[model samples]
Target: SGFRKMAFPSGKVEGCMVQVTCGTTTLNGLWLDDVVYCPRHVICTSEDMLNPNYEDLLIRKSNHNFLVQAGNVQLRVIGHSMQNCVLKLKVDTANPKTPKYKFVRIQPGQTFSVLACYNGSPSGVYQCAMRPNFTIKGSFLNGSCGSVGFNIDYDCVSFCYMHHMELPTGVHAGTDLEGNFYGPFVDRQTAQAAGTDTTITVNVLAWLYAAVINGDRWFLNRFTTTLNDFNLVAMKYNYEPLTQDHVDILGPLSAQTGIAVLDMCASLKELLQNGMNGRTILGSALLEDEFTPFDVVRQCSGVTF
Candidate 1:
């Protein structure tokens, strides 16, 4: 379709432009050449190509033509001016050490990763999940009519995962009292010898479901965003469980719940230690799934606190 400059194809002076999507990058340029080539960042026509509709793009069609405003993404403002509206993003920090909101210069239809971990190095493993965390608030028609709204996309990644989960062995081989498995997984012997009793991978799913329900926490919501998503994540996170420094990440609201999954490493170790004493703990059936409720769980070590 490289017709060169034959005084235009039909009648319009504005030429065509095409945008292409690659991994985490989008490329765009004039469509006058043999093909709209990539802009020094991605391969032309041979990458993860898809329009925003997520359908295949018609890159080589004769009648195909569109505007390419900064990667072909038009910040469309059909009913309002671009200056009168702002799109916001809800980027978060998955790192517990410096727990705070990540900074993002929000613009709609664009992709951005989250802030760095506490150490502040940049990489994909630090990419946080994206939410429609947009808000639009503005005055229009001389303030007679006004609107307010906020914003885009990110996947769940943790630079802190491998560092924290640097397990010498058995990385996914431990379970909390509530029967939810998690890890940095060490063997039972290692756990037997191990803070707050740290070996106790907390009931991760329980807190996870709570995060999704609230809809604001930086908890799992997509990219296999399921209860099991929380499960695997806990394998990495359960390394710390409910220590005071770690507990500060989510804050007081979580601890106030007094939920059944609330447990500790000593609780888990005692329960496991009692395993050789037959199938009962404090005269109640261990009942792996439910784990005999909090009252029974606390009493297993003959103390509560």
Candidate 2:
């Protein structure tokens, strides 16, 4: 019990907070969450469980962990490897345009899940997983769960809009962009930290209480599937729980909007539960203003910038 330095909490967004010393202590941060569609993503990185030769295994999406899930999504490939294991799976069956390759072997706390398929057209993987029509993709590859330290449970999360076209490559912008990436951290406070305080706020109910304390199961399944799809306020999708004015108007409609901010929080919670009178509309309430939140990230394998 000697080398101390552990303490955390500063400018929170997440993913980079790695401080290491070893021997006795220092504090290793960013503790898990490498976004394999993180429904509490987990992985084992031995250095001896907690600390023994401490490598802490921040595997970082070891070359496109590759994905696809939908067939009512429910994957659980759990194995807590202490080493001496095996997993060589490349599965994908149930049609989705052929190719049901398979190979698997996982020991030491073994568990597996296989029901894979993918296709909404395109396959080079990008251009927003090519939509507009057919949609139902599935599969998940560990390639090598970092030398077999697997702990993958899947439901295609982050409020699946088909997991925003599950990544095999980052989303488009300046066209398959790359380099010194900032998706996980600022990467050493970029040049004079680019004017520290640019200023912009609506409080957004404290960023929707820090995005529902950092996960609100994708905002309670996107507000019970937008107030149970337009019928408005039938919201008890199962013993409901989420209050504080549902994080104050879904945190200022998550600014700009995403799939049209739950159609303006299900039309302002059904017009204050309807003042009772209003016509139903569509396009996610007018094309949900036409969608946002399209920076689409968190494919961060681990310890990234």
What are the per-residue Cα lDDT tens digits for candidate 2 across 159-227?
111121123232210000111111222212122111121111112122322333334223323442343
Q: What TM-score would every model get versus the actual structure? A: 0.21, 0.19
lDDT against the true structure, each candidate: 0.23, 0.23
Candidate 2 error regions (>4 Å): 1-86, 89-240, 244-267, 271-305
**Residue 111, candidate 1: alpha-carbon lDDT:** 18
Compared with the true structure, model 2 gives a TM-score of 0.19
Model 2 global lDDT (CA atoms, 0 to 1): 0.23
